[PDB]
Design an enzyme around this catalytic site. Structure first.
Site, PDB file in Angstrom:
ATOM      1  CD  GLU A 163      -2.081   1.935   2.530  1.00 45.94           C
ATOM      2  OE1 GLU A 163      -2.682   1.377   3.476  1.00 45.94           O
ATOM      3  OE2 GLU A 163      -1.576   3.079   2.634  1.00 45.94           O
ATOM      4  CB  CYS A 219      -1.861   6.763   2.462  1.00 35.95           C
ATOM      5  SG  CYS A 219      -0.133   6.289   2.800  1.00 35.95           S
TER       6      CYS A 219
END
Ligand SMILES: Cc1cc2nc3c(=O)[nH]c(=O)nc-3n(C[C@H](O)[C@H](O)[C@H](O)COP(=O)(O)OP(=O)(O)OC[C@H]3O[C@@H](n4cnc5c(N)ncnc54)[C@H](O)[C@@H]3O)c2cc1C
Ligand SMILES: O=C(O)[C@@H]1CCCO1
Ligand SMILES: O=C(O)[C@@H]1CCCO1
Lengths: 979, 977
Positions: free
Chosen positions: A735, A769
């Site tokens: 990720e 993020c």
């Protein structure tokens, strides 16, 4: 019995004197009545009509209006008969329905209309439409609107004859009530009202409330403090209590209490006791409550106990009970009965008569433009009737308007039952305590494998005094634990190295939290060998037993919730809520992945041919390298590690250097759970020393990485090679970054969009993020949006996260601070700075809260991830460009859109192809199961943590096929295709 | 009714039958004996029946005290857990039970006991125990045993008085029957009996049967041909017909017909008509049938119509109807009634009276050791009773033994009902035609698409299927010589670089020329796929799936034609070619249903005021790099999976199967697939290989082939180039070095042909092929002797000739490389078998078996992908598992064992992607055996399973706050109040 018989008869007389008259909203001869009638008959229409009312005032051009009408209601042929010429007619009907509930749009108009109410025999409590302000400037305008109102009323009231009474002062209404009476909403007085900053919110509200109150006192008027959502209930009570004590001798100050709250019996009791203890008098406007749907949804979304009763008669019963308590205490407590319910009103009237309460100790109130026959009946029977009379415009008044529509049309609405459904009068006037007993008895007539179903761990709840008190205590406790050396943890043993790196408080870098041993390639090699030796036994462990260890670890973290949270406040600069949510997410992963392994752990028969058994099931890969980020140091680490562990792999875990103590909590939790040695190994280390080594190693079969794109891509490239002795092709679970946009469409609800965008951009200093780093705003709404966003930003404070008064604080470390600041300079040269916050002087890794306008897709700060409090504002010419611009980066992680156009939302669902798209809310704070997180493009490899596909990535499927036929016969199985 | 009147006579005769024997029970039902007790608890407890019957089967291979003791505990639990009714004792009881059904273990002992039976008044038909032989030498031993038997009886029969009768010759039984009568099992006469090679099987069996029959006629005896499993029924009928016509005047030749077969009404009519036509006479032994459980299971496993009736009364009704038909035809057809059923026997007796049949035209037969009171009953009323008397060893007799046990204990068994169940006599003797109607009438009590079923395998029991292959191979040969172009964006594109494709079993036969794409053409295809992608992605998943279903229907219609092309282009055998095509159809049907399943967004979470929907998105352009060994199936699997999930495909077929690759173009075109969604770009790997893999517009690579190429692609695909939208997804199936483990207690009659097929099926050119066989020490020499003896029976040659077991390998390069490996292997171990090959052209490699192989050897580690089998000798079960796990691969594996503990260990520890227990380790079917592994065999993707399509997509979540101004719609699954 006897009192109840009087009440029922009083109610019967009331309905008799009403003479069949319907309130305007239930008048089927009127357009309003038709539209509500159809909304009540057809739930799909109700949803369309109420949502259209909400969006209507932002349909400020002919094109917007025509398109929205078509999208909400269909073409002319397919919409109901009671419903260009069409635009004009519908506009007229919506406008007239809104005016139905207000005494004017302006102060001068309100004052004119208030005198008209007096002549028809009605008193008023005047309110300026608005709630949940967005800035200090807007709170000031609201405040000054009251001051202007009061100056005007001060001039007028001397010429007003007091409404008729039976005694008292001829210059006062009914001989006793002040002629000027106003109501104020606390959340309109301060835009960051939040019980997480309890004292800060009380003071800011109290300061403006005081200015209004002084002016009220100056004309011998009454000030009533409205009650809003449960989130602010205790704050609002504290404002009242403080203000009352500063002016203990002034009688004309009231507070609303809501009988629909389970808290209200205690709150009413405490307030009465408080009044006695301080020898002051008070005034209570008892209501049922206006936010029922909202409280139930909000509590459900956060696994909080529902703060409202959920059987409607329970609220009615509570009201009668609490009103009796107030009436009994009439010496200390003046009473405003605020209800349109004839049973309730009748109960109050008979209770007051039964206790011989003086008429100057109670009055009746209703909402303007509603329940017209009820209003007139009260005037006729009680004589003392006051209208809540708001004034202002449709946008700030929209919440109020929708609440009225909701109130009149609800299935459980007394008005709907009386005036739309022809409900029997005996049932309507029944003692609600009886109704409660009958409903409760009717209402008295899942998981898998002994386990309760999955539910997200409840969020910290700062409406609770104990939750507010927990953080300062646990932070202090953590402070007694500073200065330790954290060793590696390998095969159940502590391993010390002589390369130590300190970890420090980013908000106060001189405060050293501890020292962390660094693993060299030798120790990492040792951790991999330990994991590999533990692997055969762990792999052979029953999935349900592996799941049990996760469950025990979850319970261990739950018992340490606040402690673990406090560590994050200090080590990485999480705000209180951010810290807690990090820990609850850790718990969620443990609880969720345990259930998922139990689900996936049983071999399934595949195929149905007789004489044959095929079982499909999963095997672990081997040793997993887990390389964790610093920004979600417990949640994501635990997520990655527990998934790898529960699926039968063994883990070598590298925490981020600056959050290694949080990484040590995984050691504490797994040890506490009894996890066999070698299944989890803790190896912080310098990437420049052992990073490639860990990734290149032939005994690694899986790598779970969460971090930057440059590092993820490097790992992907290196992991692809198969070295000598290497058993598997390495599986990557990765990720990486995002450059996330939120779109603000022309028709966006700006009161929602603004605080959501601010939180998305600046929550935890923008270090997520999923953070919003680009807000893409439609041309026609741009100036309005940015003025409100900037104004709200100017209200927030930047400072240490251990102080709850601060919105955001220092960033992760010195390198991040320097990098982010350079990006802000870059951005300031590309576009134009709109806002740059002050920061505290002295030590700490502070970057200003920063907003930059004029940004275009070809600019660096529209493309590159900054991971900090730097928001780019981009101005799109039309919805098509907004989408194209949202899609103009190499990332596709999260995204958001504020729009109330069905067409634009559908276009967004289809084309705005991020991993997680959010509609009409912030684009951060994904929850396990609810929002499985992750994306593709350069944001990741299509794995989604917290979802039902995730554990599969950690395993390989196997099939065993058995021929069960021996010498011409086979056992017959239940799922065989047979004869 | 006349029918009511005759039924009354049958019931009345049954009732008197039952009354005369009232009390008496058959030996097996005597609960005072050990036999009776074991059977009793078996009939009461189905779990125990499975344990006991399986134990009987494994028993003779328990040759040491350790094997015996451990199996006993493993089948029946500890000393206290098993029923009251040691090793020496249980051995004796099971041995006694097996002896119940035989007249001896040897010919001498048999002949002695047969003479004893005559003196009791019983005729016999003698059988030598054994079926499904494994070699020509075993078939010769079996044939010679009959010859030896016949020579002995030739010498004895002169001194035999005929069994007593009513008139005629006192030297014949009952005045008319020959004293010597044998039965023979056809599948014991030829180890490769198979209707796929129909003529070759008929002749091989016929040649041995003739040798026996000549000896039979030499002593004026009777030869009866037993009927076996449905697979060999047509073969056996044709052997009977040919032998009969060779000796048209000899009357003592019979054939069995099974009334449990739906075919039997027609088969009997045809035979009677065939006999009238040729003016011969015949003899039929009419039975119900002995392979019911087998035929039902086998048919269902292959999507074939079940050849047996499935309501027990339907077989009884069939029997009575067919018996009548035979008796009506008594003038041309002699009749043996073979049943233990009193209703059935009583019906035949009254029917023979009703039709006034002469006694010399019918007799009654039962199995030795069974239904003793029924046997005595027949002897008393009819007098003409013959016992089917088998003799031999327990190992070749095991099939027969287990069939007897199943026969006596079945729920619907007449014997069980009469002698263990105390059933009402009226129900037992009722007209089965009435029972039939009752039973049938009793049984009268996903979104438009039928559920998934695998496509029916080719069925060479059918004459039309047998005729189809030569016809279609011939039709394919009229269309050779074409030039195949690239297919890009719906257009044919020719290039000047041509590579010919040839028949590996006859390389002078050129099938066509294939245009090779350069990098420019590959770039164009990729550009075409990219341009089509947005619209294809936006096409509804149900609509996408519909193209696959259309493509499946197109292929289904061309099944034998598509198969023919593979026979000629890549040397597939008929069955192998057909299976390749049906697998392609399966993928199409399966992946369509899967996309329909996955195509709907699902709500996740249950919080009100919020809707989260989770769903999938395609990746973009997929490169599909397909193998030659499964040229349609695996190509179609990877390609259709990519396409149905919304990706667009650039497809590179293997060079030597480029025409089969073109078949994808034809099928997708016939289905109407939008242009650019599928593009066909054969090309030279050295020219465009890396170009395709490296290209920035590629988002997914589906590869099936060698580990070396596979690992290279994984390396290169990992790099992200400028303009590359995604990290490339790899879906990859690479090779295996697959072992089958032969445990001490393995059934060698199963294991040998299964191992042989696994290793040499399609010349061993399968990633799933067995290239290592790991045999336990104590069973090693016996296994290899049988394995090699069966191998020596097989022939190597052109796959178009169905007589051949395997044929030429793929091409010249393959041939050269396999031969190098065979030489390396010969130096490492010791050759056990090396087959002849045809002289002349063709890429022939001998069927090769090599012994003495150990894990350190090259041919124990490296995938050869050819007909070279390593045999390895393991010292105990633990070393066997260790050795199985000693390579870098983990694709497939097999184990032949009847030990619960060892099977349990294998399930746990023999960690291949597909483990097979007691069968071949090849032939994975869609849904049933999703296929693929990890280690160096793959990346954990399983084609044909419920996880596969996920690999071709990325998940997405949309979350909507549904609350506006304090209210939201309440949804069905909301957690609420
Ligand atoms: C001398 C002799 C020779 C034989 N030779 C052969 C041979 O060469 N080949 C061969 O295949 N059989 C042969 N049989 C028949 C077989 O061995 C069994 O003995 C016979 O089928 C049992 O039938 P029944 O009348 O004795 O008993 P029953 O209890 O009356 O009948 C049982 C039979 O019904 C049938 N059946 C059972 N369940 C079902 C169902 N659910 N639906 C439909 N049908 C069902 C089966 O055929 C089963 O055997 C022979 C039998 C004898 C006596
Ligand atoms: O705002 C509302 O909806 C209620 C009614 C009056 C004030 O508080
Ligand atoms: O082998 C069997 O089971 C049958 C019974 C007699 C011969 O064929």
């Amino acid at each position: 019995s006897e009192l109840n018989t009087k009440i029922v008869n009083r109610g019967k007389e009331f309905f008799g004197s009403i003479s069949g008259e319907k309130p305007s909203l239930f008048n089927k001869g009127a357009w309003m009545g038709k539209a509500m009638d159809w909304s009540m008959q057809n739930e799909q229409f109700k949803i369309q009509m109420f949502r259209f009312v909400d969006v209507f005032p932002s349909l400020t051009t002919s094109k917007l209006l025509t398109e929205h009408i078509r999208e909400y209601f269909g073409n002319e042929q397919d919409m109901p008969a009671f419903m260009a010429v069409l635009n004009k007619v519908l506009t007229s009907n919506i406008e007239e329905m809104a005016r139905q509930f207000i005494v004017g749009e302006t102060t001068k108009e309100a004052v004119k209309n208030l005198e008209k109410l007096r002549k028809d025999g009605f008193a008023a409590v005047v309110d300026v439409l608005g709630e949940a302000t967005l800035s200090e400037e807007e709170a000031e305008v609201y405040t000054n609107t009251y001051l202007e109102l009061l100056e005007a009323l001060k001039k007028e009231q001397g010429s007003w004859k007091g409404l008729p009474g039976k005694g008292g002062d001829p210059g006062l209404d009914w001989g006793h009530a002040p002629k000027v009476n106003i109501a104020v909403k606390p959340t309109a007085l301060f835009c960051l009202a939040n019980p997480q900053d309890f004292e800060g919110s009380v003071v800011a509200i109290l300061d403006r409330m005081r200015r209004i109150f002084k002016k009220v006192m100056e004309l011998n008027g009454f000030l009533c403090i409205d009650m809003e959502s449960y989130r602010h209930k205790e704050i609002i009570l504290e404002v009242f209590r403080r203000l009352k004590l500063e002016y203990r001798d002034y009688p004309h100050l009231g507070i609303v209490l809501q009988a629909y709250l389970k808290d209200n019996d205690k709150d009413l009791d405490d307030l009465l006791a408080w009044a006695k203890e301080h020898k002051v008098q008070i005034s209570v406007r008892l209501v049922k409550g206006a936010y029922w749907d909202y409280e139930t949804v909000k509590a459900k979304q956060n696994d909080w106990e529902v703060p409202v009763w959920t059987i409607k008669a329970e609220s009615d019963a509570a009201y009668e009970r609490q009103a009796r308590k107030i009436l009994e205490n009439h010496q200390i407590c003046h009473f405003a009965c605020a209800s349109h319910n004839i049973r309730t009103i009748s109960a109050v009237m008979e209770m007051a008569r039964e206790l011989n309460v003086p008429e100057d100790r109670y009055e009746f109130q209703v909402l303007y433009g509603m329940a017209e026959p009820v209003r007139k009946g009260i005037l006729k029977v009680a004589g003392r009737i006051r209208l809540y009379a708001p004034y202002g415009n449709m946008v700030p008044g929209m919440g109020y308007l929708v609440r009225r529509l909701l109130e009149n049309t609800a299935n459980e609405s007394f008005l709907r039952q009386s005036f739309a459904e022809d409900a029997q009068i005996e049932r309507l006037l029944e003692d609600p305590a009886v109704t409660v007993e009958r409903e409760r008895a009717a209402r008295a007539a899942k998981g898998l494998g002994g386990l309760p179903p999955f539910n997200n761990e409840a969020m910290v709840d700062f409406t609770r005094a104990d939750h507010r008190a927990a953080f300062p205590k646990h932070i202090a406790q953590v402070r007694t634990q500073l200065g330790k050396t954290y060793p590696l943890f390998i095969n159940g043993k502590e391993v010390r190295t002589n390369d130590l790196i300190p970890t420090v408080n980013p908000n106060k870098p001189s405060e050293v939290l501890g020292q962390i041993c660094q693993a060299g390639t030798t120790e990492v090699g040792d951790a991999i060998a330990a994991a590999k030796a533990a692997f055969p036994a762990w792999r052979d462990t029953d999935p349900r037993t592996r799941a049990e260890y996760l469950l025990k670890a979850a319970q261990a973290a739950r018992k340490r919730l606040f402690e673990l949270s406090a560590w994050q406040v200090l080590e990485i600069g999480k705000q209180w809520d951010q810290a807690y949510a990090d820990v609850t997410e850790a718990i969620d992963f443990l609880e969720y992945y345990a259930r998922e392994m139990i689900r996936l752990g049983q071999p399934q028969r595949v195929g149905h041919a007789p004489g044959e058994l095929n079982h499909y099931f999963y095997e672990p890969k081997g040793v997993a390298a887990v390389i964790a980020p610093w920004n979600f140091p417990l949640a994501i680490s635990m997520g990655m590690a527990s998934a790898a562990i529960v699926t039968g792999n063994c883990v070598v875990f590298k925490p981020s250097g600056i959050t290694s103590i949080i990484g040590w909590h995984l050691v504490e939790l797994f040890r506490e759970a009894g996890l066999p040695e070698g299944v989890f190994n803790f190896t912080p280390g310098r990437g420049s020393v052992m990073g490639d080594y860990l990734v290149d190693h032939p005994d690694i079969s899986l790598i779970a990485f969460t971090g930057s794109m440059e590092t993820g891509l490097r790992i992907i490239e290196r992991a692809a090679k198969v070295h000598p002795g290497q058993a598997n092709v390495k599986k990557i679970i990765s990720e990486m970054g995002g450059k996330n946009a939120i779109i603000i469409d022309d028709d966006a609800d700006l009161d929602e969009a603004v605080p959501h965008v601010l939180y998305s951009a600046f929550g935890f200093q923008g270090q997520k993020c999923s953070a919003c780093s680009r807000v893409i705003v439609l041309d026609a709404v741009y100036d309005k949006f940015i003025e409100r966003l900037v104004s709200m930003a100017k209200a927030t404070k930047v400072g240490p996260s251990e102080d709850p008064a601060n919105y955001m604080g220092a960033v992760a470390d010195d390198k991040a601070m320097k990098s982010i600041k350079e990006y802000a300079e870059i951005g300031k040269r590309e576009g134009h700075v709109l806002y740059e916050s002050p920061v505290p002087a002295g030590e700490g890794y502070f970057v200003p809260m920063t907003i930059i306008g004029g940004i275009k897709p070809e600019h660096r700060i529209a493309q590159e991830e900054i991971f900090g409090p730097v928001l780019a504002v981009m101005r799109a010419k039309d919805f098509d460009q907004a989408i194209e611009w949202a899609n103009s980066t190499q990332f596709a992680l999260t995204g958001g859109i504020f729009s109330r156009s069905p067409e634009h939302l559908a276009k967004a669902r289809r084309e705005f192809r991020v991993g997680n798209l959010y509609i009409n809310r912030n684009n951060t704070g994904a929850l396990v199961e609810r929002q499985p997180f992750g994306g593709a493009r350069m944001s990741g490899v299509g794995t989604k943590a917290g979802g039902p596909d995730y554990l599969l990535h950690f395993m390989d499927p196997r099939v065993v096929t058995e021929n069960t036929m021996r010498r011409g016969f086979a056992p017959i199985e239940e799922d065989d295709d047979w004869v």
